[PDB]
Amino acid sequence: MEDYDVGGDMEWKRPSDPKFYITWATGKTFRVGDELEFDFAAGMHDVAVVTKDAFDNCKKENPISHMTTPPVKIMLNTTGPQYYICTVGDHCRVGQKLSINVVGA
Ligand SMILES: [Cu+2]
């Protein structure tokens, strides 16, 4: 098991570059049992676990899950695609979103 800090010291923030998080994930093999940790200041960002469509269009309403208090720690316990976005402001629209593929432990 591996523990990942989404974004690095950049943490979970509004990116200057729209592909930042695509870049951060790349080269990482997320497996079942691994844990993602999103760090941010209270109210400045958040985490909503969404479907692929909601991910693509940045739909904030009807999350699978939604978390607001800062480290949001999520364990990956199923194989397959997982999508996360920040619903605060225009953050998702400018790239604060994460797409990963979880494989076996
Ligand atoms: Cu945000």
Give the span between the Cα atoms of 65 and 10, in whole angstroms.
23
Q: Which residues contact 14 (CB under 8 A, 6 or more apart)?
A: 45, 86, 89, 91, 94, 95, 96
Distance 80 CA to ligand 1 centre (A): 24
Preceding-residue numbers of gaps in the chain (C–N over 2.5 Å)? none
Q: What is the resolution of this structure in A?
A: 1.9
What gap in Å lies between CA 37 and CA 5, rounded to an integer?
A: 5
Q: How far is the CA of 30 from the centre of ligand 1 (A)?
A: 23
- The CATH architecture to which 1-105 belongs is Sandwich (2.60)
Looking only at the bridges linking them, the beta strands covering 65-67 and 47-50 are: antiparallel
Place of tokens 């200057």: 16
Question: In a 10 Å sphere around its CB, with 0-12 CB exposed, 13-18 middle and 19+ buried, how is residue 91 labelled?
Answer: buried
Please name the method used to determine this structure.
X-ray
The strands making up 65-67's β-sheet, listed across from edge to edge, are 30-31, 97-103, 80-85, 47-50, 65-67
In sequence order, what are the residues at sequence separation of 6 or more whose Cβ sits closer than 8 angstroms to the Cβ of residue 41? Answer: 70
Q: Exposed/middle/buried for 11, CB within 10 Å: 0-12, 13-18, 19+?
A: middle
Q: If you measure from the C-alpha of residue 105 to the centroid of ligand 1, how many angstroms do you get, rounded to a whole number?
A: 30
Please tell me whether residue 32 adopts helix, strand or coil conformation: coil
